[PDB]
Each structure stands twice: as C-alpha cells, then as structure tokens.
Structure 1
Amino acid sequence: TDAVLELPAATFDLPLSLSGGTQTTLRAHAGHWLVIYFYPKDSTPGCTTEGLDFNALLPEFDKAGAKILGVSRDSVKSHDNFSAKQGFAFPLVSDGDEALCRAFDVIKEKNMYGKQVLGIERSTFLLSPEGQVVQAWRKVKVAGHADAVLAALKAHA
C-alpha cells in the first residue's frame, strides 16, 4: 500500500558497479533507508550541484542511518574522477547498461530533432529499510532538491 513504485524483483540483485571499484546491490542495503538519485551526466553543472548538495547534507542523512547512491550511466572511471574532484563521500553507481535506470523507469523520451530521443530524466527515490520505494521525484529541479529529499526522509523514517 505504501510503495509508489514496484520494481522488477531482479532489480534488487543487480550488481551495481560503484565508484571505487566495488559493487553493491539494492538488497545489500536492507535494514536502512536508501536514497537513490539519478542524474544525467557526470561533471555537468546541474549534476555537480545536485551531488554537492547531497554531499553537504550527508551527516543529516547519517543521523537517520540512511545511505545515498547517485546513479548515471557514466563509467566507473568518470565516476571516480567526478567523485574525487567534488569530494563526494557517497558512492556513484556506474549504470552503464542502464539496467537500474530502466528498473526505475527514468529513461524518458522526448520528441526533438525530428527524432525520438531517450535520456536519463533526473529523478530520485526513497527506499525503505525493506526495499520499498516509498517516494519518488521525477523531472527533478536541482535547486532545493536534496533539502526536499532529506525532509521527506525525515518524515518517512
């Protein structure tokens, strides 16, 4: 009743390549809140602002035992470079095959350039300690977003 999104069951066991060379899975995060924020491109203004915003709020997320994962389809190397430059203290998922993106249905289409163009739509999701997606933000505007996500986490937790 509380889920706003149902993920394919296999989603939770997908090996997610992280910045730093390790993997995680959503199931591995059982027992605590997880924020998953999808962004279109490493090292761009909006995605950097969003990452830095979450990073600045990390201790507030820590208070709730929550973990953050940023997700794009950039490579692990790109993620490493991005994370190092910005000083992120949470992992970035290299979703190169967009398996996680598709599971969360963040690959969206736009009619532009006389074509049908797919891309990551900036989106964020709150996952409960039992892996339920209890809140979603789509077509995210970066300004104030990490604040809003933190507030929602605090409301839910």
Structure 2
Amino acid sequence: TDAVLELPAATFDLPLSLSGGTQTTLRAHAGHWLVIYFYPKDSTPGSTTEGLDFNALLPEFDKAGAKILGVSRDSVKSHDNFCAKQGFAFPLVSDGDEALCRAFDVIKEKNMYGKQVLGIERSTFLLSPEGQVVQAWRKVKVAGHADAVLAALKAHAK
C-alpha cells in the first residue's frame, strides 16, 4: 500500500557489480534505508554534481543508517576512476547489462533523430529497510536533488 513501484522478485537477488570489485544485492541491504540514484554516464557535469552533492551529505545519510548507491551502465573501471577522481565515499553500481535499470524502469524512450532512442533517465529511489520502493524521483533535476532526497528520507524514516 506504501510501495510506489513494484520490482520483480528476482531484482533483489541480482548480483550488482560495484566500484572496487565486489558485488552487492538489494536483499543484502535488508535492515536499513537505501538510496539508489541512477544517472546516464560517469564524469559528465550533471552526474558529477549529483555525486558530489550526495557525497557532501553522506554524514546526514549515515545519521539515518542509510546507504547510497549510484548506478549507471558504465564499467567497473570507469566507476573506479570516477570515484577516485571525485573522492566518493559510497559505491557505484556498474549495471552494464541494465538489469537494475530495467527493474526500476529507468530506460526511457525518446522519438528523436527519426529513431526510437532508449537511454537511462536520471531517476532516484528510496528503498525501505524491508525492500519496498517508497519514493521515486524521475526526470531528475540535479540542483537541489540530493537535499530533497535527504529530506524525504528523514520524513519517511521517522
């Protein structure tokens, strides 16, 4: 009744390749809040700003016991470079096959260039300690976004 999105059950057991060489799964994050932010491409201005914004707010997320995951379809090596360059203290998911993206339905289509063009739409989600998607932001505007996500988390966690 509180879920704004229903994920296929298998989503929670998908092995998610992380920056740094390990994997996680959504089920492995049971027991705490999880912020999942999707962005199209490593190292672009918008995505760097978004990542730096979350990073700067990390202690506030820590206060709530929450964890952050950034997600794009870039490689682990790209993610490692991006993370090292920017100093991110949270992991990035290398969703190269877009399995996680599809589960969250963030692969959106646009009729452009006389074609049907599919791409990651910047989107963010809040997953409860019990794995429910309780809030979604789509077609995300970077400015003020991380602040808004934090506020929403604090409202939901209470």
Give the TM-score normalised by the residue count of structure 1.
Answer: 1.00
Q: 1:79 & 1:53 partners in 2: Cα distance?
A: 17
Q: 2:119 & 2:36 partners in 1: Cα distance?
A: 17
Q: State the Cα distance separating 1:145 from its structure 2 match.
A: 0.2
Aligned to 2:155: 155
Q: State the Cα distance separating 1:34 from its structure 2 match.
A: 0.0
Q: 1:26 & 1:88 partners in 2: Cα distance?
A: 20
Q: 1:28 & 1:125 partners in 2: Cα distance?
A: 17
SS at match of 1:110: strand
Instruction: Provide runs of 4+ in structure 1 moved above 2 Å.
Output: none
Q: State the Cα distance separating 1:7 from its structure 2 match.
A: 0.1
Q: State the Cα distance separating 1:85 from its structure 2 match.
A: 0.2
Q: State the Cα distance separating 1:92 from its structure 2 match.
A: 0.1
SS at match of 1:148: helix
Q: Deviations over 1:98-129 (max 9, x none)?
A: 00000000000000000000000000000000
Q: 2:56 & 2:118 partners in 1: Cα distance?
A: 31
Q: 1:73 & 1:59 partners in 2: Cα distance?
A: 27
Q: 1:50 & 1:141 partners in 2: Cα distance?
A: 9
Give the TM-score normalised by the residue count of structure 2.
Answer: 0.99
Q: 1:21 & 1:72 partners in 2: Cα distance?
A: 16
Aligned to 1:124: 124
Q: Deviations over 1:59-99 (max 9, x none)?
A: 00000000000000000000000000000000000000000
Percent identity, aligned pairs only, is 99
Q: 1:147 & 1:50 partners in 2: Cα distance?
A: 10
SS at match of 1:81: helix
Aligned to 1:91: 91
Paired residues, number: 157
Unaligned runs of 5+ in 1: none
Q: State the Cα distance separating 1:47 from its structure 2 match.
A: 0.3
SS at match of 1:154: helix
| 1:53-64 correspondence runs (5 A) | 53-64=53-64
Q: 1:32 & 1:3 partners in 2: Cα distance?
A: 16
Q: State the Cα distance separating 1:144 from its structure 2 match.
A: 0.2
Q: State the Cα distance separating 1:10 from its structure 2 match.
A: 0.1
Unaligned runs of 5+ in 2: none
**Correspondence 1:40 to 2:40:** yes
